[PDB]
Amino acid sequence: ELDGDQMISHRELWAKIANSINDINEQYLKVYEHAVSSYTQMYQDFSAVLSSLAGWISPGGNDGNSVKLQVNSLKKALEELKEKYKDKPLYPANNTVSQEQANKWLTELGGTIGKVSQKNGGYVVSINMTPIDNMLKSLDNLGGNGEVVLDNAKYQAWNAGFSAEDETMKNNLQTLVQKYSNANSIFDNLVKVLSSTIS
Amino acid sequence: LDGDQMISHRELWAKIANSINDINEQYLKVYEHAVSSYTQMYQDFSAVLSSLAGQVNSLKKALEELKEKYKDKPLYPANNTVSQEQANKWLTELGGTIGKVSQKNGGYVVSINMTPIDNMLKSLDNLGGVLDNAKYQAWNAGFSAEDETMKNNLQTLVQKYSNANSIFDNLVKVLSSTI
Ligand SMILES: C[C@H](CCC(=O)O)[C@H]1CC[C@H]2[C@@H]3CC[C@@H]4C[C@H](O)CC[C@]4(C)[C@H]3C[C@H](O)[C@]12C
Ligand SMILES: C[C@H](CCC(=O)O)[C@H]1CC[C@H]2[C@@H]3CC[C@@H]4C[C@H](O)CC[C@]4(C)[C@H]3C[C@H](O)[C@]12C
């Protein structure tokens, strides 16, 4: 299928290289850029919830360290977070793609960061909100109705799992940022290789 | 420069092969050697940290044994020298914490940054000279901490090399996605 005898003018070569550089920017770099931007915004809003949590935790019980946790306030904050990003996917930025295109980018970004979701007849790679869903299930398992008092043992157990899901989102965001950095360098190197064919 | 000049696909293949080879030589093989030299150095520092069992003149014997061993073992380049700006781009790429641009003459190298072992010596002489169970262990905390920073310098370098390999692997994937 390789044909070494195929001839191309230098002018045709310049235009084909230009066309390919544009395609790779539109279909690869800009895709990564929006995915990073979307996850970054989600984790920024989660971090505001984190700041708000300090107001939802306060000394409780009688003498000593018990913690009163405003569970319904935290619960609705995380529910509103999921609701804000239901329609802000990692890919694509606008409209939808086919299932194969979505699965392709699901694989590239990672099945723990994204999740393929059907919008209309088309598909998107949504932000995978499993860490938030885990926090909400864990909150519902604290029981109580609205507000719960947690002794040291139960506060430490709840907080350890909550922080681990926060850490997971941080790890996810770090991996996405590193992948976008690498994609930028893959693009730079492709430009250099293609330009070398003109040398 | 003449847009009408014709070029064959097999000529294009040879130019792309040339550029792939250049990237391996100029980028990947540079990272690999830097990982190698900082690894061998930190592995030799693990020598003296495992021999802590045995006092202070014992330690300097083997601690600037180390600095001496690696003064002509730069991170980059492997052989000969480069210009100052070439050394500065690779120091930028590898990190000012782990390397230091150094003028031999004939040109410049990016030597291994030996400040963790300098820092350890400053604290070594600082104390005096026997240490009680209280401030022997404060010292060992400072010593163990510089081990940790060299340890972490190595880790960060290995990660950058891993990412550089990924970049190369993906470049080759793109270029071979038709064949
Ligand atoms: C292998 C990738 C595939 C990227 C894509 O999906 O287009 C592409 C990217 C740029 C492509 C090349 C562009 C210049 C050349 C165009 C000529 O007509 C003959 C083949 C060349 C050398 C192309 C070969 C190859 O098709 C390339 C290297
Ligand atoms: C980009 C051209 C042409 C592709 C096309 O015309 O569609 C292809 C054709 C021959 C290809 C090479 C063949 C040998 C090598 C195979 C390796 O697994 C990747 C690097 C090499 C050096 C290839 C790199 C490159 O992928 C080439 C040069």
Numbering used by the authors:
A (entry chain A): 122 to 320
B (entry chain B): 123 to 176, 191 to 265, 270 to 319
Question: What did the article's authors report about this structure?
Answer:
Like many Gram-negative pathogens, Shigella rely on their type three secretion system (T3SS) to inject effector proteins into eukaryotic host cells, driving both cellular invasion and evasion of host immune responses. Studies in Shigella have demonstrated that bile salts found in the small intestine (e.g., deoxycholate (DOC)) interact directly with the injectisome tip complex protein invasion plasmid antigen D (IpaD) to support interaction with the hydrophobic translocator protein IpaB and its stable recruitment to the maturing tip complex. Here, we uncover critical mechanistic details of the Shigella-specific DOC signaling process by describing the role of a π-helix secondary structure element within the T3SS tip protein invasion plasmid antigen D (IpaD).
X-ray crystal structures of DOC-bound IpaDWT and DOC-bound IpaDΔQ148 were critical for resolving this apparent conflict by providing the first molecular insight into the role of IpaD’s π-helix in the DOC-mediated Shigella virulence enhancement pathway. More specifically, comparing these structures shows that eliminating the π-helix does not eliminate DOC binding, but instead causes the single binding site for DOC to migrate approximately 10 Å, now docking in the cleft between the two central helices where the elimination of the π-helix occurred. Furthermore, the π-helix backbone atoms in the WT structure also occlude the distal end of the mutant DOC binding site.
